[PDB]
């Protein structure tokens, strides 16, 4: 949908996991929708959540993911 766009992740979910946990990562930088930075994720066992790009556990899991 491209009429009214809000953040790809309006909030974040503060649950530290490991790259083996997370099978999809998508990094959304401040858009014309939301002037913030948002990490979208899918954990294979672990659902598809929103992540805090500022949180160090993520920094690893995403870094080591990519």
């Amino acid at each position: 949908s491209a009429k009214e766009l809000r953040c790809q992740c309006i909030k974040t979910y503060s649950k530290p996991f490991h790259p083996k946990f997370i099978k999809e990562l998508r990094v959304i930088e401040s858009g014309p929708h939301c002037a913030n930075t948002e990490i979208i994720v899918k954990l294979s066992d672990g659902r598809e959540l929103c992540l805090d790009p500022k949180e160090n556990w993520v920094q690893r899991v995403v870094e080591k993911f990519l």
Partner: peptide
């Protein structure tokens, strides 16, 4: 796989600690 960039040093290993995951909270649309 990746590629591109230049300069660096240090880094690598996966995980972290404290906390955990699954559970609930998160959302968007």
């Amino acid at each position: 796989m990746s590629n591109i960039t230049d300069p660096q040093m240090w880094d690598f290993d996966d995980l972290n600690f404290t906390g955990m995951p699954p559970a609930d909270e998160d959302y968007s649309p």
